[PDB]
Amino acid sequence: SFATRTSLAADLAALGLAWGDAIMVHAAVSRVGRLLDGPDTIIAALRDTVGPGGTVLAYADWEARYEDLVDDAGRVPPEWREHVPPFDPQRSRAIRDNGVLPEFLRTTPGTLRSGNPGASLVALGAKAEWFTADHPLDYGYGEGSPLAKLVEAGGKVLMLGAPLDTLTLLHHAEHLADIPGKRIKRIEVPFATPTGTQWRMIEEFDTGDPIVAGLAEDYFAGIVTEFLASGQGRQGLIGAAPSVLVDAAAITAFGVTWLEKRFGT
Amino acid sequence: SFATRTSLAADLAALGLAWGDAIMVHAAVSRVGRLLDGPDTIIAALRDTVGPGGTVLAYADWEARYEDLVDDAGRVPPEWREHVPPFDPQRSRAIRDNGVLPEFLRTTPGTLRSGNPGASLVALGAKAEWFTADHPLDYGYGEGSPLAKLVEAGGKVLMLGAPLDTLTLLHHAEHLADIPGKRIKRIEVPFATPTGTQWRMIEEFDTGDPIVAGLAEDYFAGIVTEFLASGQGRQGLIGAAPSVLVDAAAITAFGVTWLEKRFGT
Numbered sequence: 344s345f346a347t348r349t350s351l352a353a354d355l356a357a358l359g360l361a362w363g364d365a366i367m368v369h370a371a372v373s374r375v376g377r378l379l380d381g382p383d384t385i386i387a388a389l390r391d392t393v394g395p396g397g398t399v400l401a402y403a404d405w406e407a408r409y410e411d412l413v414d415d416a417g418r419v420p421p422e423w424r425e426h427v428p429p430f431d432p433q434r435s436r437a438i439r440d441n442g443v444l445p446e447f448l449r450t451t452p453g454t455l456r457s458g459n460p461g462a463s464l465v466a467l468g469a470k471a472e473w474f475t476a477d478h479p480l481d482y483g484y485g486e487g488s489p490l491a492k493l494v495e496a497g498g499k500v501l502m503l504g505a506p507l508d509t510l511t512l513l514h515h516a517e518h519l520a521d522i523p524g525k526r527i528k529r530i531e532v533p534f535a536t537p538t539g540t541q542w543r544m545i546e547e548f549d550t551g552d553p554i555v556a557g558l559a560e561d562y563f564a565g566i567v568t569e570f571l572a573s574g575q576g577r578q579g580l581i582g583a584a585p586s587v588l589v590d591a592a593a594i595t596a597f598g599v600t601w602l603e604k605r606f607g608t
Numbered sequence: 609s610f611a612t613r614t615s616l617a618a619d620l621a622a623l624g625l626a627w628g629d630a631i632m633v634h635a636a637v638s639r640v641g642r643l644l645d646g647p648d649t650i651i652a653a654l655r656d657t658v659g660p661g662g663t664v665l666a667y668a669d670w671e672a673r674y675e676d677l678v679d680d681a682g683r684v685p686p687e688w689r690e691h692v693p694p695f696d697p698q699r700s701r702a703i704r705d706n707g708v709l710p711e712f713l714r715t716t717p718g719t720l721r722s723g724n725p726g727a728s729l730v731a732l733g734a735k736a737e738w739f740t741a742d743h744p745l746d747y748g749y750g751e752g753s754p755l756a757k758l759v760e761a762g763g764k765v766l767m768l769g770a771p772l773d774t775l776t777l778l779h780h781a782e783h784l785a786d787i788p789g790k791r792i793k794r795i796e797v798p799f800a801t802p803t804g805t806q807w808r809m810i811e812e813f814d815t816g817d818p819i820v821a822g823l824a825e826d827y828f829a830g831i832v833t834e835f836l837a838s839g840q841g842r843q844g845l846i847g848a849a850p851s852v853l854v855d856a857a858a859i860t861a862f863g864v865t866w867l868e869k870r871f872g873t
């Protein structure tokens with residue numbers, strides 16, 4: 344009646360998580376079952392399974408409710424500017440729309456957070472410095488991004504009971520997909536610098552909706568389902584949670600090909 | 609349509625919070641209204657109002673779900689011992705039963721947390737070291753406790769939209785009250801030391817229920833209501849939240865006298 348740090352690490356090993364892996368986690372903590380330490384049991388079991396050579400990652404994003412006040416060019420009206428809290432990678436809370444684990448991971452001692460606010464990842468472990476260094480502010484889901492570094496390092500993504508449409512790495516596949524009609528989001532973001540608040544415009548492919556028209560908003564779940572149905576990845580229980588584990592480079596290439604087949608040439 | 613760091617500090621000043629105050633906060637963040645930075649706007653406004661000479665405090669407690677496995681002497685059965693996460697004052701999460709603000713305060717850079725797990729307070733500011741140092745493990749709501757140091761320093765308690773029965777300092781009044789039939793809670797707690805897990809028995813007056821029989825479980829709210837009805841304390845809005853501000857030494861003495869009149873001699 345209690346999933347422990349030991350039992351969860353055993354479930355993670357049986358699922359496919361290995362010593363030295365860089366693992367990115369999307370979790371629905373309620374579905375794991377009753378935990379002795381709450382979400383920190385999940386974090387501890389992941390660190391135990393990958394060892395000091397591994398790295399645990401999560402999608403942090405940023406809690407910035409000021410997006411309801413921007414006009415049409417994405418800037419902030421002058422009456423609201425100095426009221427918007429600027430982004431500090433060490434103090435800005437992770438978004439909690441898709442669960443509380445990224446914030447729990449962000450506040451775990453040793454965790455590093457990248458510089459692109461809306462696309463920030465948290466990393467804890469051996470390669471946390473490289474995974475979070477020099478995050479390009481424009482198109483933060485693309486070439487120089489932590490999501491690209493996860494693919495390059497041969498990392499893995501674990502859907503720990505979370506809905507399959509929340510896989511952030513598939514936004515990296517959307518950025519890479521050579522297709523037409525890609526939607527773009529522009530917004531101004533306040534940054535905290537040792538001299539005050541400095542504003543800056545951010546450009547990236549819009550990850551608030553499907554990258555192109557004609558797709559259901561949860562269509563990431565279909566891509567993951569087809570990926571598993573093709574005999575790739577592994578499925579199994581983590582505690583009481585139905586979980587999915589995929590290779591980062593494989594699911595990205597599968598996601599790009601999924602898009603380049605139905606759209607473009 | 610947006611309570612800001614500036615507007616909240618103005619509401620706090622109008623309520624009675626002053627420069628240099630040591631303020632302990634019980635908050636219901638949802639009732640404050642729409643915040644630009646979430647709960648961190650409340651923390652920032654409190655720090656702004658009290659200044660670098662002040663101190664912001666909250667009741668942290670401890671997220672320890674292992675209390676359902678103890679027998680009748682309060683110890684942990686041998687099969688569960690090494691599975692229970694030990695208490696680390698720097699890493700143990702604050703309880704979130706009465707809101708998320710204590711955990712947000714605990715993870716704010718610079719905040720210190722005291723050593724008594726179940727009675728731990730978080731402190732951020734000038735006297736955070738003294739407020740959290742040398743917390744007596746047995747009877748942690750009594751003489752050497754942060755709640756007693758708050759009374760000694762002339763601190764204040766702010767009920768920021770929270771229910772009035774959640775005022776932790778009234779447990780210090782229960783400990784001090786010279787009355788009969790005081791209930792006692794005993795439990796064993798794992799502690800993290802630089803050499804491993806060390807277990808220890810904790811004794812204190814039971815704060816999970818009224819200190820004596822014959823009291824409704826929310827009777828703290830009646831004491832606060834009588835205290836305000838007697839012309840003491842101040843009431844007003846903090847954002848959109850009906851709030852209460854009281855002097856720590858006054859509400860404690862009023863709480864003790866409230867108990868010593870209806871019970872004992």
Ligand SMILES: NC[C@@H]1O[C@H](O[C@H]2[C@@H](O)[C@H](O[C@@H]3[C@@H](O)[C@H](N)C[C@H](N)[C@H]3O[C@H]3O[C@H](CN)[C@@H](O)[C@H](O)[C@H]3N)O[C@@H]2CO)[C@H](N)[C@@H](O)[C@@H]1O
Nearest residue numbers: 404440441461462506508509510511550551552560561563
């Ligand atoms: N969905 C409709 C659209 O949502 C936008 O805002 C959305 C946006 O801020 C935000 O979208 C966020 C992005 O930020 C972030 N960079 C990646 C993350 N996957 C995404 O999340 C969203 O897309 C996922 C599906 N991949 C869903 O599983 C998830 O529940 C959903 N919140 O959530 C809001 C609602 O989804 C705009 N309101 C408007 O373009 C339109 O209303």
Ligand SMILES: NC[C@@H]1O[C@H](O[C@H]2[C@@H](O)[C@H](O[C@@H]3[C@@H](O)[C@H](N)C[C@H](N)[C@H]3O[C@H]3O[C@H](CN)[C@@H](O)[C@H](O)[C@H]3N)O[C@@H]2CO)[C@H](N)[C@@H](O)[C@@H]1O
Nearest residue numbers: 669705706726727771773774775776815816817825826828
């Ligand atoms: N209430 C019934 C009793 O609750 C106990 O457990 C309780 C205990 O762990 C815990 O009680 C906690 C204490 O820890 C902590 N040290 C101080 C805090 N004010 C108190 O909180 C409790 O008392 C307040 C009223 N002052 C309420 O406002 C609050 O909602 C309530 N959770 O919440 C649990 C439920 O209240 C035991 N289950 C049993 O003795 C009996 O069932």
